[PDB]
Ligand binder design. Structure first.
Ligand SMILES: NC(=[NH2+])NCCC[C@H](N)C(=O)O
Ligand SMILES: NC(=[NH2+])NCCC[C@H](N)C(=O)O
Ligand SMILES: O=C(O)CCC(=O)O[O-]
Ligand SMILES: O=C(O)CCC(=O)O[O-]
Ligand SMILES: [Fe+2]
Ligand SMILES: [Fe+2]
Lengths: 337, 337
């Protein structure tokens, strides 16, 4: 398979769960300054085989994601799936939020966005009634199209972590790598050139944040990125293993550039054709390599009966200092005027 | 002080030394594939207070370096300072080489250069007889001028680790940050523009590697960088806390660009004026932030009596994948055609 996979033994999973539960006892919140600082060191106490996997798999050249299977989740303890991300920090989900951050700490520095889900670091992916046909994570009936997370931003995550709290109907996350076996060298050349526009996605809009947050200055920066996007490349780095920056619904060619458009058009077709499925069953965690792969989510019919699919999510950078220009008073919540 | 400092307790230092000694027993070499992979996980067994320091201090906004004092070194066990880096992997220095790599593993991914000290990851800084007045690390009588490590390369280290095996006469390492208190905004603007040339330093030349290594294709890339340097910026990122890329002896303005030259001239003067000293006593380890600070070494009179100043050195990147274009058959030894 095109991702790297690790299955916790029941004992290893229990030990990891126990560690997260201890953290949940000792800290007030996952996004508090204290746990943000301590989590990377506390993570050193996770099962050694898992730490070895995370240290090695991160350095392999090929995988689109690192997938860890077998974290126990008790639906009775977890409670009902929240109706909105706003109210999704439920006591039942609290230990698993801590668990996700512990795993994340092995791969890098976690962070959030001032303009997304009220500046939370641990965020939620769940269907919101009335928002089935939107372009955001809370959609359902409309497929979430493939994308690089926060493609518009130079400070976008290196890895995106997704922990499945529940997924009773096995709804697939989608993935695709760079279609290197089919991109001709001229098209490739053009994709490496700064000839494309990527605008911020709808999750960064004021309407998709709580009314209280609407005043934030960081929404100014989002508006600038939407109104006056600077041309950037889709592919960067090594021609034989390029890094990818694209969003199927928020990318465009530079104005009037038909050669760039043709390259983007070809890329779309090749990515659509090579898109594959990864089902995150309850307790599965994936860390998607946001430079090697784009990802999305298959269309599904939401339940709204309290047992909808529900993920916890977190952004990870290999280097927090790369985004210091966007440190919005805090280094862990990013945005700009 | 402008760096972050940690002093090991005798017990902590002994525990760290013991761990490195165990590694030296169990692995054949520091640069072998096995220890390179395992070191970051083995480092989780270092004293917890040190791990906390390394995790937190790396994320602070201000320090030019992370300095760890108090690693014991026994000169009798260490043996005489080698006459050349070639023969510097002495049994007496072996545990301390492992120790350096363990500390390095807490901060990132270590790597070396195909074109420097025969592609070694752990390298040596010691005076070489006949080479006192050179621009390389083995100089002495001539001051090693301030520089960003491997400034010419986009794959240059994020952190440079220096472990002092001996330094009986307290020879100072030099450091300077961006002179933000004195750079006017016009000069600053120009330094942020791609109007400067940075060429590879002499340590990357064939003459400063073993005759056997002379055939390496990676020297081709060095020659290209020396002959046809592409214009780059000196300052990048946040205007209020810029990252720095400059080498006092290998930087130049773009051809005929007198405004760029004036900005570089001003920068030189301000850096010379703000340069300060850090003395790495025997057993001290510094991890210099290669983006916030330039560094060098004061002129000193070499002894050549077997007790010359001697450091082990290692390059660290926050993300090995950023250099995949330069993975010279191995991800840990960098270079290009
Ligand atoms: N093509 C897209 N739908 N892009 C936006 C992806 C979803 C976005 N990351 C969110 O949290 O809502
Ligand atoms: N300005 C300079 N002297 N630059 C080169 C610095 C020394 C170089 N890093 C070496 O290992 O030899
Ligand atoms: O629901 C999923 O599996 C993915 C959600 C997502 O890509 O959010 O940006
Ligand atoms: O000798 C020192 O302290 C520094 C050596 C160095 O900057 O090597 O590039
Ligand atoms: Fe996404
Ligand atoms: Fe140096």
């Amino acid at each position: 398979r095109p991702w790297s996979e690790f299955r916790l033994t029941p004992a290893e999973a229990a030990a990891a769960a126990a560690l997260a539960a201890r953290c949940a006892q000792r800290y007030d919140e996952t996004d508090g300054p204290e746990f943000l600082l301590d989590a990377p060191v506390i993570a050193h106490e996770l099962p050694r085989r898992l730490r070895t996997f995370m240290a090695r798999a991160r350095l392999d050249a090929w995988p689109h994601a690192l997938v860890v299977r077998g974290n126990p989740v008790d639906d009775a303890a977890l409670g009902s799936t929240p109706v909105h991300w706003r109210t999704a920090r439920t006591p039942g989900s609290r230990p698993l939020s801590f668990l996700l951050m512990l795993y994340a700490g092995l791969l890098g520095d976690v962070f959030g966005w001032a303009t997304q889900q009220d500046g939370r670091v641990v965020t939620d992916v769940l269907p919101i009634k009335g928002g089935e046909h939107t372009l955001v994570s809370s959609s359902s009936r409309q497929e979430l199209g493939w994308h690089t997370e926060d493609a518009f931003s130079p400070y976008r995550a290196d890895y995106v972590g997704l922990l499945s709290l529940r997924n009773p109907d096995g709804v697939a996350t989608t993935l695709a790598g760079v279609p290197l076996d089919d991109l001709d060298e001229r098209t490739l050349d053009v994709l490496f050139q700064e000839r494309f526009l990527i605008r911020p996605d709808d999750s960064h809009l004021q309407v998709n944040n709580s009314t209280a947050q609407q005043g934030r200055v960081e929404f100014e920066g989002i508006a600038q990125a939407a109104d006056r996007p600077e041309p950037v490349a889709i592919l960067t780095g090594h021609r034989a293993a390029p890094h990818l920056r694209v969003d199927g619904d928020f990318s465009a060619p530079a104005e009037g550039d038909e050669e760039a458009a043709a390259a983007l058009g070809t890329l779309r077709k090749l990515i659509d054709a090579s898109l594959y499925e990864l089902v995150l069953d309850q307790g599965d965690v994936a860390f998607i390599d946001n430079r090697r792969a784009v990802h999305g989510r298959r269309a599904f019919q939401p339940r709204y009966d309290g047992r909808d699919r529900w993920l916890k999510r977190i952004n990870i950078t290999r280097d927090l200092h790369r985004s210091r220009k966007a440190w919005a008073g805090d280094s862990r919540v990013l945005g700009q005027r």
